[PDB]
Amino acid sequence: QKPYKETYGISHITRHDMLQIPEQQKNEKYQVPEFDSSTIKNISSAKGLDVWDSWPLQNADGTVANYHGYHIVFALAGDPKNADDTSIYMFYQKVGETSIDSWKNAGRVFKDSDKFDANDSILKDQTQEWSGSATFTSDGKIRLFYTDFSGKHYGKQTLTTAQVNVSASDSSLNINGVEDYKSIFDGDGKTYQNVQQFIDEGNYSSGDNHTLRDPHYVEDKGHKYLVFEANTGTEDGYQGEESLFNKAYYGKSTSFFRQESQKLLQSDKKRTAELANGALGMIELNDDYTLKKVMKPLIASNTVTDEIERANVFKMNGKWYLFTDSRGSKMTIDGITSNDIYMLGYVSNSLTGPYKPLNKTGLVLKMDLDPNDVTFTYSHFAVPQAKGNNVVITSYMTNRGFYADKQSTFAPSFLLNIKGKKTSVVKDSILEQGQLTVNK
Ligand SMILES: [Ca+2]
């Protein structure tokens, strides 16, 4: 194949930028702070469940919602002994409370029968409920977005929505049921990979990693959008042998492309790089939360990784910030190790781009603790605040199923300062486990 250059009109996580991160991450400004293990508790109301990926009910701009005097957090939870047991639970606290013990458990959002009652062909084949977002609508409704995962159908992932009906009193919140429960998007082949394309390759034994998940709701000028984890399709730079010859994925210069591409082609990461075509996708929704328009990806990670998770985007003090989490173990970049886990980040003057890397490289947070460390954290997520230069970073702590007495739980939150195209972790800014806002 001959070298070429094609950006497909989207932004790219380039090899040159990623190569700078191993040295840069030694700076404490870009590091998840050390946590004190003797302060860490299980979520008392979870009654022995692992509780991992979590997200707050948000207003349209990403700030934390107030539902009838309560904060609400949705989270994946399940039996630590069963890695395929994943359902969405709803936790809640009175606004003003900060202790992890303040989080009550309203239980599962869904009954097993809900996916059938929905009259939705894709939903009736669901086996797990994976991550998403939740927005608090202008008419006072809890509008959930999540990932319908189907183990029956080779790990199909479908962006899904429902309204969660919740009664509020002075003491409790109670889930009454759901409505408007429907599949929104399962890929289109041309812009975002679908599960058939995964099956074409030989599914899991191909080494390909198909994703279409973690939908994050946001609005701009009254238009409604989901930004989500995906993989590219056939028309915006697909996986394949030819992808390694696209200079847009390398950056820097032709000299760098020649050197880096020849190294990659000679390496044991050639196949991994060919398969790697992660993307942060975007769709516009209609006012009833159905699909209006498939839009081009905000950014892609061709050759670098197939898996960029927990898509997040919001406007803060005049700029738009786009984040994603990614494991070094699934990357193909020299100097990045299997211990390294990142939140990467990008900035634009507009929701729809173009996005350029924060801190020159894309690095925002680095966590490299051993998987066995009780204070291991993952699924880092920046929660915008109503005012100021800080966001709150939430994450889950402790790997699923590792310890009998220490379950996956809410990590201590901490602060990230954002100004312009730069970020820095705020010194000694550790908050309570699962704390969503600085204000209280
Ligand atoms: Ca792929």
UniProtKB/Swiss-Prot annotation:
Binding annotation for Ca(2+): 208, 239, 275, 277, 306
Induction of expression: Induced by sucrose. Expression is controlled by the sacR non-coding regulatory region, located upstream from sacB.
Bridged cysteine pairs (disulfide): none
Alphabetically ordered keywords of this record: Calcium, Carbohydrate metabolism, Glycosyltransferase, Metal-binding, Secreted, Signal, Transferase
Any one Gene Ontology molecular-function term assigned to this protein's record: levansucrase activity
Marked site (Transition state stabilizer) residue numbers: 214
EC number(s) given by UniProt: 2.4.1.10
Name the record gives this protein: Levansucrase
Organism: Bacillus subtilis (strain 168)
Gene name of this polypeptide: sacB
